[PDB]
Write an enzyme that holds these catalytic residues in place. Structure first.
Site, short mmCIF file in Angstrom:
data_model
loop_
_atom_site.label_atom_id
_atom_site.label_comp_id
_atom_site.label_asym_id
_atom_site.label_seq_id
_atom_site.Cartn_x
_atom_site.Cartn_y
_atom_site.Cartn_z
N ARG A 37 4.29 -0.47 13.86
CA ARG A 37 4.93 0.33 12.76
C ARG A 37 5.07 1.79 13.24
O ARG A 37 6.21 2.34 13.17
CB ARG A 37 4.13 0.21 11.45
N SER A 89 -6.85 2.51 3.08
CA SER A 89 -6.06 1.67 2.13
C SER A 89 -6.97 0.80 1.26
O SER A 89 -6.83 -0.46 1.30
CB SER A 89 -5.05 0.80 2.84
N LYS A 128 0.37 3.37 -3.15
CA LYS A 128 -0.75 4.27 -3.34
C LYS A 128 -0.30 5.73 -3.48
O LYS A 128 -1.06 6.49 -4.06
CB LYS A 128 -1.81 4.08 -2.24
N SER A 168 0.82 -1.24 0.00
CA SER A 168 0.00 0.00 0.00
C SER A 168 0.85 1.29 0.00
O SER A 168 0.24 2.34 -0.24
CB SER A 168 -0.99 0.06 1.16
C1 LIG Z 1 -9.06 -6.44 -3.83
C2 LIG Z 1 -8.71 -7.34 -2.65
C3 LIG Z 1 -7.28 -7.15 -2.28
C4 LIG Z 1 -6.72 -7.71 -1.02
O1 LIG Z 1 -5.30 -7.41 -1.08
C5 LIG Z 1 -4.46 -7.86 -0.13
O2 LIG Z 1 -3.46 -8.52 -0.36
C6 LIG Z 1 -4.86 -7.38 1.24
N1 LIG Z 1 -4.32 -8.26 2.27
C7 LIG Z 1 -5.09 -8.92 3.13
O3 LIG Z 1 -6.30 -8.72 3.22
C8 LIG Z 1 -4.41 -9.89 3.96
C9 LIG Z 1 -4.17 -9.83 5.37
C10 LIG Z 1 -4.58 -8.83 6.38
C11 LIG Z 1 -5.22 -9.23 7.54
C12 LIG Z 1 -5.64 -8.30 8.47
C13 LIG Z 1 -5.43 -6.95 8.25
C14 LIG Z 1 -4.80 -6.54 7.10
C15 LIG Z 1 -4.39 -7.48 6.16
N2 LIG Z 1 -3.49 -10.87 5.76
O4 LIG Z 1 -3.26 -11.65 4.60
C16 LIG Z 1 -3.83 -11.04 3.54
C17 LIG Z 1 -3.67 -11.71 2.22
C18 LIG Z 1 -4.46 -5.91 1.48
N3 LIG Z 1 -3.01 -5.64 1.33
C19 LIG Z 1 -2.46 -4.61 2.25
C20 LIG Z 1 -1.68 -3.53 1.47
O5 LIG Z 1 -2.01 -3.30 0.28
O6 LIG Z 1 -0.78 -2.96 2.08
C21 LIG Z 1 -3.68 -4.05 3.06
C22 LIG Z 1 -3.32 -3.65 4.47
C23 LIG Z 1 -4.42 -2.90 2.38
S1 LIG Z 1 -4.83 -5.49 3.21
C1 LIG Z 2 -5.45 5.58 9.64
C2 LIG Z 2 -6.73 5.01 10.13
O1 LIG Z 2 -7.60 5.87 10.70
N1 LIG Z 2 -8.75 5.16 11.13
C3 LIG Z 2 -8.53 3.90 10.81
C4 LIG Z 2 -9.57 2.89 11.08
C5 LIG Z 2 -10.44 3.02 12.15
C6 LIG Z 2 -11.42 2.07 12.38
C7 LIG Z 2 -11.53 0.97 11.56
C8 LIG Z 2 -10.66 0.83 10.49
C9 LIG Z 2 -9.69 1.78 10.25
C10 LIG Z 2 -7.27 3.77 10.15
C11 LIG Z 2 -6.68 2.54 9.68
O2 LIG Z 2 -6.41 1.66 10.49
N2 LIG Z 2 -6.43 2.40 8.38
C12 LIG Z 2 -5.60 1.31 7.88
C13 LIG Z 2 -4.27 1.85 7.33
O3 LIG Z 2 -4.28 2.25 6.14
O4 LIG Z 2 -3.27 1.84 8.09
C14 LIG Z 2 -6.30 0.50 6.78
N3 LIG Z 2 -7.68 0.10 7.15
C15 LIG Z 2 -7.67 -1.16 7.90
C16 LIG Z 2 -9.10 -1.65 8.16
O5 LIG Z 2 -10.04 -1.08 7.58
O6 LIG Z 2 -9.21 -2.55 8.97
C17 LIG Z 2 -6.79 -2.09 7.01
C18 LIG Z 2 -6.27 -3.27 7.80
C19 LIG Z 2 -7.49 -2.56 5.74
S1 LIG Z 2 -5.35 -1.04 6.47
#
Ligand SMILES: CCCCOC(=O)[C@@H](NC(=O)c1c(-c2ccccc2)noc1C)[C@@H]1[NH2+][C@@H](C(=O)O)C(C)(C)S1
Ligand SMILES: Cc1onc(-c2ccccc2)c1C(=O)N[C@H](C(=O)O)[C@@H]1N[C@@H](C(=O)O)C(C)(C)S1
Lengths: 242, 242
Positions: free
Chosen positions: A227, A95, A50, A47
């Site tokens: 982080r 994200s 982005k 991410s």
């Molecule tokens: C269009 C669908 C795309 C999903 O695209 C991924 O690959 C995402 N990854 C996951 O959903 C996870 C997680 C996990 C679990 C809990 C909280 C956050 C992530 N564990 O394994 C997988 C697979 C997204 N990739 C990350 C990113 O782009 O940085 C994200 C935090 C947005 S989360």
């Molecule tokens: C900043 C920030 O500010 N507020 C939130 C929040 C508050 C309540 C609920 C959800 C997010 C938040 C945040 O954590 N945002 C995350 C981030 O980009 O770091 C993204 N979103 C997570 C998810 O939606 O679970 C993710 C695991 C997909 S990565």
């Protein structure tokens, strides 16, 4: 100059964790890290991609401004905040991968490749799906290359318009008070080993700017709050923030 | 002090190629490069790994001295100079892979890993096959990391005997005359993208030493002579050689 400061390793040990923090002092033009080798190791950006994706989508007119609404496509995904309408500000905050996949499909392979060469971004390699190469394709970037890219964004020196650079800097806003402003983006690389977390950006003070880039081993999502926590422990030890 | 000198890019564009040259002035302790980013990007070492592999084989007694004969195994290979008996001098001159693969099998995984940690050599990772990891496994090194390693060899500061270091510097001898001495090693990496050529070593003058490390894109073996020719164009421009 790069200078190694192993005393920051304490902040990682405290949580039984491993990784790197890189700082750059803009006024003095000097860099600092706990691990010079890992500071130059190239990983998938996930991410953190982005930031360049937003710049390109604005400059080509795929995104008109920061208020344009991207309607939910109706597919229930496992992340609750993705199952709703977004704009650029909210899509970066939560994200929202599916919004960024649709931008990449409209940019296309040819324009994406030419823009990343002009940005001098990491290894400049987009091999894989046009709408997933930053999650499971061939693109790679180090913490020091993240700083080089972010310094050009800060100074409006990327080849895209001043306007595209100003809007993306607005979308990066994370924290502000009487002492500091943080503009930054999180990332989590989970599709290809090794699993890592990112935080990249900068701290604005009255009279200077500190750029930062950190990554750390993230075998599960339970440690994602480390982080920011570990990075803020280093900034306090260096007297950058109270 | 690291200084970027983009006028060197003319010697790459002349020959329709892309790459990096890194110089280090030992007397002044200053570095010069045409590309600060590529100078710190990590690649497979390929045949530049024959410098550390020679040092380890000598220090463990796998190679007794520079005169010991390694008799051809009688399997006909592609490169005619490989189909004959060799000693350390001729094996490095002709880059005889099969001789160095047998050295690696006698050293073994545990001793090879311990010595690369003791040398601080690149990412210090030997994952893959013990007889081919520098050609297609996990080991990576940057141009600036090749300089760090060569400076320790020049000063007899690596953790092997003085004798092992002197014999390897003899095997590196490439060119000598009344103006300069070059000690160096070529490399050519093709098993993983991107395909690259290396030249690493130093230039001994009457009262100074200039360390160098170059790598360049190498799509076919037709450009291999450019490794040396582009490096000598930079040395000439900086008036290090006539
Ligand atoms: C269009 C669908 C795309 C999903 O695209 C991924 O690959 C995402 N990854 C996951 O959903 C996870 C997680 C996990 C679990 C809990 C909280 C956050 C992530 N564990 O394994 C997988 C697979 C997204 N990739 C990350 C990113 O782009 O940085 C994200 C935090 C947005 S989360
Ligand atoms: C900043 C920030 O500010 N507020 C939130 C929040 C508050 C309540 C609920 C959800 C997010 C938040 C945040 O954590 N945002 C995350 C981030 O980009 O770091 C993204 N979103 C997570 C998810 O939606 O679970 C993710 C695991 C997909 S990565």
């Amino acid at each position: 100059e790069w200078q190694e400061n192993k005393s920051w390793n304490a902040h990682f040990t405290e949580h039984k964790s491993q990784g790197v923090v890189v700082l750059w002092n803009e006024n003095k033009q000097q860099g600092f890290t706990n691990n010079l080798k890992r500071a130059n190791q190239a990983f998938l950006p996930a991410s953190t991609f982005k930031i360049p994706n937003s710049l390109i989508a604005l400059d080509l007119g795929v995104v008109k401004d920061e208020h344009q609404v991207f309607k939910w496509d109706g597919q229930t995904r496992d992340i609750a905040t993705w199952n709703r309408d977004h704009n650029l500000i909210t899509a970066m905050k939560y994200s929202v991968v599916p919004v960024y996949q649709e931008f990449a499909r409209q940019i296309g392979e040819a324009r994406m490749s030419k823009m990343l060469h002009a940005f001098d971004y990491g290894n400049e390699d987009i091999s894989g799906n046009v709408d997933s190469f930053w999650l499971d394709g061939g693109i790679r970037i180090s913490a020091t290359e993240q700083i080089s890219f972010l310094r050009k964004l800060y100074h409006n020196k990327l080849h895209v318009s001043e306007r595209s650079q100003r809007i993306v800097k607005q979308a990066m806003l994370t924290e502000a008070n009487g002492d500091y402003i943080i503009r930054a983006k999180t990332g989590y690389s989970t599709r290809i080993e090794p699993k890592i977390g990112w935080w990249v950006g900068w701290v604005e003070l009255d009279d200077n700017v500190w750029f930062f880039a950190m990554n750390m081993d993230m075998p599960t999502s339970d440690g994602l709050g480390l982080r920011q926590a570990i990075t803020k422990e280093v900034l306090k030890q260096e007297k950058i923030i109270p």
